[PDB]
Amino acid sequence: ASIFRCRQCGQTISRRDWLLPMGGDHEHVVFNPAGMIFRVWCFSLAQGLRLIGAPSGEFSWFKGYDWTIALCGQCGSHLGWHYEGGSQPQTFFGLIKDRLAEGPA
Template sequence: MLQFNPDANTERDSDTRKDDELYCSNCSKLITRGRWRIERNDDHEHAVFNPAGQIFEIACFKEAPGVGVIGQPSNEFTWFKGYHWQIGFCLNCNSHLGWQYSGADIFFGLIKSKLTSRKS
């Protein structure tokens, strides 16, 4: 009798998982995965600016295990109504990667230029 093992990875599954990974562009630490993309304000990607006028292109993810957070949650100049933000950094090299947002749920707004799909 043929049995199916749900934990078994096929070669194709393995390739898909590998291609799905997003790394810190500074140190190559695994930060998040494409399958964890989410939409906020009807979009996955956003162009936003801070009070100093710096523009960021960010992408939203429901999980980012490679990101640590620092600072007290703040709702000042939040880009997502009803959410507080904290600065997010790479757990390996401490590079600023974006922000963690907390409100009705928790998600990450990560700076696109700080992520790469290639592990160096």
């Protein structure tokens, strides 16, 4: 239970070692304006994503951060967001827990 992959295709995405307790918890449950609930796990680092467009602060769930949609770079599945423009840390990833599969390195 050491690396996280895209559930839909297997792409390598992150690692348990890279979980980041933001505001004291690595897990944050949030909703967008369309009412969709997301169980977000914060990671300091991720790979294999494709970050879409330019950042936006609108509706940001993390104070001081602007976001970009993060797709699986391989299959296009929406895996979460990349956050930037903030402080301590400047950047991080918020990934949707149930869209990842955990398993051995």
